[PDB]
């Protein structure tokens, strides 16, 4: 949600773990453009570890 | 073919690529699902 | 295949992407039945000789 | 007794690239038992004269 | 496969879309190595009576 990113030359690479997250909001309700998966199945992202 | 079931519904345009089969959505989900087995034709026009 | 675990794949995978990754692996598996039975037929026929 | 051969599972199989080498070790004993095999008919054609 | 030459999967096709390509050249090599092993060993059961 934050206004200003960074570049493709130099970005900004955060790291997130030790929490619990919701993926229906993200993916399930979706207000975005283009959402892609390649090697993990998009549905089960809130099963899989 | 036996039969054909003509499905008319307007839907908006960030959310027409979810009508395929194996999607989960929105509009996908709790609406309109299609199986793996499904064949069939998606034929789309701009009515706005 | 990507994993040799059939709870790795089906729940790894999609319904559509599953079953390219699954026919692989049965058919991988059925080729090394073919050499076993085969292996223990011409054992069969050196042990009645 | 008849003529003694052994194939080497490097050359018949990949065209001397390095990407086929990599793509082995998924499909891994296949060609070992089956080179294990043919020593074992050839331990056998000795025996024979 | 369209090519039988693994250099001329390489150097043209995507790396997604080269490793359905060799792995069928792959494929096809070993069911010719388990077509030879087969024969000499019944061969060798031959030669052995």
Known sequence: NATRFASVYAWNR????????????????????????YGVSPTKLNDLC | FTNVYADSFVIRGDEVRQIAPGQTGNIADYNY?????????????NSN | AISSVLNDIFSRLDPPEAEVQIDRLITGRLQSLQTYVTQQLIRAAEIRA | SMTKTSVDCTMYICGDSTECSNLLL?????????????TGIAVEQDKNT
Not at chain 1, 20 to 35: E, K
Not at chain 2, 33 to 45: H, M, N, R, S, Y
Not at chain 4, 26 to 38: D, E, P
Request: charged fraction near 20%.
């Open chain 1, 14 to 37: 955060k790291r997130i773990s030790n929490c619990v997250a919701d993926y229906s909001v993200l993916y399930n309700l979706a207000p975005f453009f283009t959402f892609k998966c």
């Open chain 2, 33 to 45: 699902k299609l199986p793996d087995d499904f064949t069939g034709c998606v034929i789309a026009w």
């Open chain 4, 26 to 38: 998924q499909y891994g004993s296949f060609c070992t038992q089956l080179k294990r095999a043919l």
